[PDB]
Design a protein around this nucleic acid. Sequence first.
RNA 1: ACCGACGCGCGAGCGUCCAGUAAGACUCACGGGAAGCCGAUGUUCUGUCGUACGUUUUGAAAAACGAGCCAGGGAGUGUGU
RNA 2: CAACAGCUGGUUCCAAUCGAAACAUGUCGAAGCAUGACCUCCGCCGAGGUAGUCUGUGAGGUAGAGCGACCGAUUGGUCCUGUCAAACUCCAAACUUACAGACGCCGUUUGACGCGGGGAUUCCGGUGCGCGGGGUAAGCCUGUGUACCAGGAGGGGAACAACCCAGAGAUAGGUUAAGGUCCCCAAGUGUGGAUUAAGUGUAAUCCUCUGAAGGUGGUCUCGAGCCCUAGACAGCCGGGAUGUUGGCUUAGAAGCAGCCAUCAUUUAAAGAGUGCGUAACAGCUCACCGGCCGAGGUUUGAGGCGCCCAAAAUGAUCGGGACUCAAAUCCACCACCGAGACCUGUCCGUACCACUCAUACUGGUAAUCGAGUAGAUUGGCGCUCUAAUUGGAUGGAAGUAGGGGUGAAAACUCCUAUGGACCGAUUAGUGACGAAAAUCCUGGCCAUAGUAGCAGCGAUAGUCGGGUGAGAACCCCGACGGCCUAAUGGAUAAGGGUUCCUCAGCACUGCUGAU
RNA 3: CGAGAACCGACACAGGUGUCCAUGGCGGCGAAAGCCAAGGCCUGUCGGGAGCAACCAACGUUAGGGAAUUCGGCAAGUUAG
RNA 4: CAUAUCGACCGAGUGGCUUGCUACCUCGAUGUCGGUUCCCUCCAUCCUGCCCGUGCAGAAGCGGGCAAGGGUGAGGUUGUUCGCCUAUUAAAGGAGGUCGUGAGCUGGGUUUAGACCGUCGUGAGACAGGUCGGCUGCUAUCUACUGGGUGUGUGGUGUCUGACAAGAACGACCGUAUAGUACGAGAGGAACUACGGUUGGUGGCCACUGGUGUACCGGUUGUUCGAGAGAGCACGUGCCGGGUAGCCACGCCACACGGGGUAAGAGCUGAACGCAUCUAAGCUCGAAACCCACUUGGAAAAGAGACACCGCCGAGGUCCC
Lengths: 146, 359, 165
Amino acid sequence: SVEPVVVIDGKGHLVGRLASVVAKQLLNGQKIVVVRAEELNISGEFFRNKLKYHDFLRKATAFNKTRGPFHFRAPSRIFYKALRGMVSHKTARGKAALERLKVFEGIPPPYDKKKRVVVPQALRVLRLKPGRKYTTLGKLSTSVGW
Amino acid sequence: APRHGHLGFLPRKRAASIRARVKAFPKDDRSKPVALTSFLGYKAGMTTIVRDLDRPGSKFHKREVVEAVTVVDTPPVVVVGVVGYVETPRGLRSLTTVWAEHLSDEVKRRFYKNWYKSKKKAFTKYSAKYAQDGAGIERELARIKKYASVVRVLVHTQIRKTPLAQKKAHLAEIQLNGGSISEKVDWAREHFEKTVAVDSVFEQNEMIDAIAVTKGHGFEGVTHRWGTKKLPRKTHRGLRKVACIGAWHPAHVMWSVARAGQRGYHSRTSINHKIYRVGKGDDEANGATSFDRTKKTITPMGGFVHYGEIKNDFIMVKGCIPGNRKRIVTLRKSLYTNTSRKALEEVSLKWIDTASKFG
Amino acid sequence: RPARCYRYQKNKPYPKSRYNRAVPDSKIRIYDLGKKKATVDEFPLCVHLVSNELEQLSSEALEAARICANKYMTTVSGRDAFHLRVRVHPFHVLRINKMLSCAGADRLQQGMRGAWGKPHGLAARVDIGQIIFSVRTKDSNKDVVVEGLRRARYKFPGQQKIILS
RNA sequence: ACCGACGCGCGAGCGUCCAGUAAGACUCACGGGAAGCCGAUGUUCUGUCGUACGUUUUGAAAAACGAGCCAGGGAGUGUGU
RNA sequence: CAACAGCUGGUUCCAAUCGAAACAUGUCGAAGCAUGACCUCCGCCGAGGUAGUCUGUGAGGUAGAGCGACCGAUUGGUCCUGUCAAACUCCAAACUUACAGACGCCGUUUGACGCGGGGAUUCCGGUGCGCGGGGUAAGCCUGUGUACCAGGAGGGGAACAACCCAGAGAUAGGUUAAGGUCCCCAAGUGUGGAUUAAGUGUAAUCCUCUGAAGGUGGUCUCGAGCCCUAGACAGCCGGGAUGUUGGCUUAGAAGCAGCCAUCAUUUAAAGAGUGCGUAACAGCUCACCGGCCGAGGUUUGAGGCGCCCAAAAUGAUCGGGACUCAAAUCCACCACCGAGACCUGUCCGUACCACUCAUACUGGUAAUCGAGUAGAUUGGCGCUCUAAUUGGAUGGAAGUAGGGGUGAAAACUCCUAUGGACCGAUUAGUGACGAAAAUCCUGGCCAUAGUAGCAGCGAUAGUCGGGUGAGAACCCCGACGGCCUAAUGGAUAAGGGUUCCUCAGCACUGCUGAU
RNA sequence: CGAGAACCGACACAGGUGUCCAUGGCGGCGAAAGCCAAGGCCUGUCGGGAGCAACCAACGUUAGGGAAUUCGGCAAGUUAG
RNA sequence: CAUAUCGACCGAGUGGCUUGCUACCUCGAUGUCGGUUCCCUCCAUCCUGCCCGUGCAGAAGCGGGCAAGGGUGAGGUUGUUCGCCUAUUAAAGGAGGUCGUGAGCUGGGUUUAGACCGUCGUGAGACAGGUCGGCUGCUAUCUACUGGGUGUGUGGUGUCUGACAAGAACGACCGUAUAGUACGAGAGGAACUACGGUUGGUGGCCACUGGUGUACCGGUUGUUCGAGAGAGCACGUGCCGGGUAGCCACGCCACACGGGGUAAGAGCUGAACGCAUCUAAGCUCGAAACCCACUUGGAAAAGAGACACCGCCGAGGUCCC
C-alpha cells in the first residue's frame, strides 16, 4: 500500500486541526495518511453541517452540471478536500505533498499499528460542559449515500 | 420546463455490440444457480392473444385480449464454459475457465476454427488446448484461500433453425446465482457439459426484464431525438433547430440539452415483462388436433414479417416491447425489480391470432 | 407615507410663514390634554416620553400617536385626573420633489435650481433626549399612563424610552 | 547580560556598580587542492511582481478607438515683417 | 484646390533641472480664444523674508445658546404654564484674519524678498475627510476648506485611481510601518481572564461590509425588587365553614358587570372575598388554613460565547479551506513576521564649496538633494549635392539580414553572412531634407483551407464497345438512351473584328481533364 | 458569330439585345399543353462512392378533425374544358 | 372576546420581477415592441403529501407550518404587453435569465422615403392624432454544448463489476362497494380500505382501426404513334377509384408498492426547577418532499477494474466477398 511516514489516527479529533498539521508536514515532505476518517469530528452541528456540506439535502452534491464544482461524499474525500484547502494544490510542491497524503476509510485503522494523535486536537467528549453536539465523519457522509 | 427527453441513458452514443450486456443480475437465495440467469433467442413479430384473466381480486376472470405479443424464438442454448472471477481491489477479473468438448458444429465463426497461424485480427474463443481440471482446481483453491466472485457461463445461442441466421452465434456470459458459492460452483459445472432451454430458468407468468438495442436510424435532428419543438415559421422551412444551447462563460455547452446525434440503436432493458407463454413447435395436444406434423402454435400464416415461420421452442412476452426488433437478439433475465406477484406456471391462452401480417 | 426622506434632518431652517404659504394644516389635535388649568404638577407618579433619537416627527406622526395615547388615558374616567402635555410643535416645513430644481435625491428636482419641493406637510424634530410628551397624576392604577405611550411609542420613527417617574 | 552589591517604587518592576565586561562581513599570509576548474547565449523549471502598446478619458485590461504580420515610405517647411 | 473647420486621428533619437492648470474677468462665449492666477527660463536688485508657534494691538456674529432683549412664529389657565427661527439677537465660542515683537526656519559664493523681460501649458476635472445648499434618494447636482488621484512607485486591503503604511537613484546588509502570526502564506495552533452556541462571528472605511421599528431554564457574567431560621421556594405538600344567592339592580347578577353595605356566627382559621371562570350557578385560585424539612428563594433588567423580526432569480460562502475552553468576541499581555519607509557599506547623478583656464582633475558638504503627465530649460541628430582640408575600398565599398558596443535621444559604431563597386570624415555652403501606431501608403507573406464554390434553373444525360495517343469519364467512330420544336432549328440587323479554314501545338486560357 | 462561349454587362455572366421563317405531323378553339418529325444537341460542361444518416432546397401522399394555425387562410388546396 | 379571522398608525427589514435615478458605461453602431420556439432558475407553494389552529359537529371551508417530487392547458376581439370575454380544469400562480431568446424564426405595431383625413401654420411643413403601402446581410477562427473517432498515460475472445451520472417516470382526477351508513331534528351527508376507469406525462410497438403508400392494378378526358393492340406526354402520378409492405397515431402495450431517515405536527420517558414539561441527553411515529427501491448511461474512476478461456508463431483481428 502507501508507505506510511507518520500515520495519524483521527477518531474524536477535530478535522481541520488535524488537517492543518498533516498539510504542513505534508508540505515538508512527510508521507502520510490519516485513518479513521469515518470518526473524525467537527463541532457545531446537526443542521448547518448537514447543509453547506455534502448531503443529498446539502445539495452540495447534485448542485450543478457542466460547470461544477463537485464536492465529496465519502468521509475520505470530505476531509481530503479539507486537506487540499490549506495547500497550494494547483502547482509545485502543492500537488506533490498533496498526492503524498491519503486518508483512509476505517473503523479501527486498517493498518496494523495504532497511529498517533496530534498536538491536542482531541474531542475530549466526556461530560462535555465545553462540548456540545458535534458529530461528523461517516454520519454526514451516511445521510449522504456512500 | 419540462426538459425535453430525459437524461438517464447517456450519453446516447451508438451502441457497442448489437448484443445486450446486462449491467446487473438478480440477487438470489434458494437458487441453483441457473448460470443462464439470462437466456435468450430472438424476435419474430407478433400478433395478439386472448387470455383468461389470471387471479386478480377483480371481477375479470374471463377472456380478455392482451397483446400476446412478440413471440421470440428460443431456444435451446448451450453454456460452454463457466468462468470464475476472483479478487480485488480493482474490480472483477477473470480467473480461469472450464471447457467443454462438444463444440456446436457452427461455433467456428466468432469462435474456434480460427487459423492456427496467428492472424492480425485477434482470435476469438477457440480451444483445443484443454485442461478441464486445473481450471477446476484453480477455482477451488482460489475459493478457500483467496476469493472468487460471482461465476457465470459463456453461452451461445444456436441458429438451429431460424429464418436467415448462421453458424455465427453471438453470445455473452450470464451469471449463475446459487446459494453459498461452492454449492453453486458445483451447479455450474454440471450444467457445463450439457445443454439447456428456456424451460429451465423461466416459467409462464414469471416476470423478466428484457434487454436489447433499439432499432433505429442514424443521426437525426432535435425533434425526433428527445422531442423538441419545431418551428416557429421562419426557420420553419429549415430543420427544427432548438434555441441556442447555453450562453455564457463556457463557450461550448455540455448542455444535457437537445443535440443532434445518433438515434435508433440503443441498449436498454425493459422491466417486468410478464412471460405469458412458454412453448414449442412440436405438436402436443390435450385432445386431437391437426396432424401430419403441424407447426408451431403461434406464427402467422404468410410467415411473420421478413423472417417467417416458427416451428420450435418459443416464448411469448406480453405487451411486446421488445426493446429492439425483428430478428435481433434480446436477452432474458429474471425480474430484478419486480412489482406485482407472480402469476401461474401457465396462462389459459384461449386463443392466439394467426393471420397473415398483411391483410 | 412612508416617512423616510422626511424625518432625518439633512436640511436647515424654516418654517418661515413669510416665505412659505399653502402649508397643510396640522392634523394634530390640541396640545393640552386632561384637565388643564389646575396644576397637575402636584402629583405622585411621573413622566415618560423620551425620544432617544434624532428627529423630525411629522404631524402625521404625532396626532395618531398622542390621541391614540389619550384614547387609552380615557380609562381614567374622562375628566378625572392627569393633564397631558405635548411638547414640540410641527413647525418645520418640508418640501418634496417638484421637478424643477436639481436632480437626484429629494430637495433636488430636475434641471438645476428651480422648483424646490412643493410644500407638503410639517414635522417637529427632536434631539437624543427630549421629552416628547409628558404628564401624569397620582398612581391611578399600576400606571395606565405608562401603558399609554406604550401605544404612543410604536408610532414614532424613534425608539422612545418610557423613562421612570 | 545574569548573579551579587546599593538605592528607589503601592506594585509589576526600575536606577547605580559590576560592564560596553568568544564570535563577527571584507581583505591578506602559509599550506593544500580544482582546469568544465573559477568567471554569456538558447530553452525550460522554481520564487517575487505583473490584466499589452498608443490614444480618448475624471477614470482603460477594458464589453471605449486603432492595427493580421513584416519591410520600405510616412508629419514643424519657405519668404516677408 | 494643398477650399475652410474652434471637430476626430496621427506627429519618428537618449539623458539631466524645474514642474502645472482643470480656476477668475471679457468674449455670437461655454468642444474656442484673450487677459489674469499658476509653471519655466533669462537679466537686474540687494537684505531681508515669514509656510509654524507664542504674546501684544485690532477685525468678525457662524456653532451653541436665548428671547420677563427686538422680531415673527407657537400652547393652556386662573400670574402660572407649553414651544421655535437660513433670511431673530440681550449674549457668544472654537476658529479664520490685518499688523507688530519674539522663537523657529530661511536668505546674503545656493542672492532670498522683489523688479523687468522670453516661452508656455491650462480655463471637460475627480475622490476622501470636515462644513455645507438643493433633492425621497443616487456611483445625484452644485459650493467651500484640505489632502490625495489625475501626473505617485513600493507594502497592505482577495481583486480595486484617490482607504491604511509610504512618497522612490543603483546595489547590499539590517530593523521596522500598515497589516498579520491554524493551513493555503512569512511569523503563535501565544499567556491570564470572561462572554457567545447563533457557524452569531472570522466584514476598519465603502455603490461594495445591510439589517429596522424568529426562537433558546445551553452556559457564563453583572444589576435591581421582593421573600427567608418569628423557617422562606418546592419553597414544597394538602385544603379552598354558617346566616347568605347580604341589600339593590338585572333576563340573570349567587365573593368576582354595576351601586350600597361589609356585619354577625362557628372557629385553629376562613374576606359579605384576589384573580380565572359560568348565561347565571358550578369549578379553579388567593386571599385564607394546616403540614413539612432546613437555607437560601423568587421576580426582573443587561451583557459574553454557543445552540435551533429576516423572501429572489446559473453553484452557497468570511479571499478559500476550515474554525467553537476558538482560528469568534471583549479586557489585558508576551514574543515574532512583515516595504523601496528608517538605519548602514560602496557607487551614480544633481547642486554647492575648495583648487583650477576648465563645466578636465583632486578633495569636500547635502538631516535640511534624487517620483512625475502638459509644459519651460539644458548636455548628448539625420538626408542630397557643391567646395577646401583629408581618409577608406576587389586583402571586398554601398545596400541588405542577423547579432555586439555607445549616446537621455535624434542617432553613431563594430562583428558575421550576403553583396560585388563604390564610400566617407572635418569645415563652409546647398535644398524637390526626415516611426509601433494615423479604419496611415505600397509591396510581400502566414493563418484562415486543401475549406466555400465547380449541385439548385421544366434542358437532371449518358452508357457499352472501338479509334488516336506518352497519357483519354468528357477528342473522334458506331450502337443504344435522351434533350430542344417561335427554339438549343434556318436566315439576318446592330455590335464584334479574323473569332472563319488548314496544319503544328498545350507554357496561357477552358469552373476537372484534354490528344 | 449573331449568342446559356464570337454582341453589352470587368468573365466562355442563369441578365440584357431588333427583324423574317406564325402553313411540318397528332392534338385542339388555338401561333395553347403534351408527344413526335426535319434540323440541332448531349457544352445551360467536373467526376467517383455510401439505401445515400442528421440538417437544407424543390416536391408527392398522409387516417380522424377541418382555420382550432396566424396580424391576416400567408402558404397550399378547392373549382376547372 | 386584539391575536379563528381582518388589522390602521408608527417602527425595522429582505428581494432585485416594476418604475425612477446614475447621466456612470456604449454614438469608428451591444439590432426595436409583441409573438414564437428552446433551456435553466426564483418563491415568497396554486394543486398534490404530511401536519397545526378554527368563530373545527359533519360536509364544505378559512388561516398557518414543512415541503420544489410531479403537475399547473384550449379558444373569441386587439399588433398588442396588459386586459376583457367563453367553455373546460385539480388549478388553469406570479417573476428573473441584456424587459432570456432576430450570426433562430416572424414582421402585425413604433419610427425612413409615397399618400389621405382631422387639427395647426401665410407658407415650406408639423403632430408623443388617425390611416393604407412599405427590405430582415455573413461559407464559424475561438469558445460552449450534443454525438462520433484517433492517440497518449495507468495479446485476444466472451462475460461482468460500479465510482459516479440522469429521471417525474410517474402526477392527478372521476366512479362503485363502504353507505343513503357515521354525524344530524331535519335538510343534508363523510372516511379507512378494496376495486373499475379517465386525464396529463413517459417508454416502446403495428396483430387491430386509421393515414400514407408519384410500388402496383383498374377506369377515363385530350393528344401523338394510321386503326386495333400496346404505349408517350398533360411537373414531374393528367384526373378519378382501390391499395401490399414499410413508416406511422387518431391505433395498441407497459410505467408500484414497500422500506429507511426527516420537516410541520402528534406523542413517550425525562431532568434542569423534588411538581409540571414532547427536549435539554434518550425515544415512538409522522409529508406528493429526502435516501433506497426501479429504468438509463457508465473501465479514461490515473487506485485507469474483475473473471473464465484461448494465445505469444500464431489466438484473434483488419481488408475482401
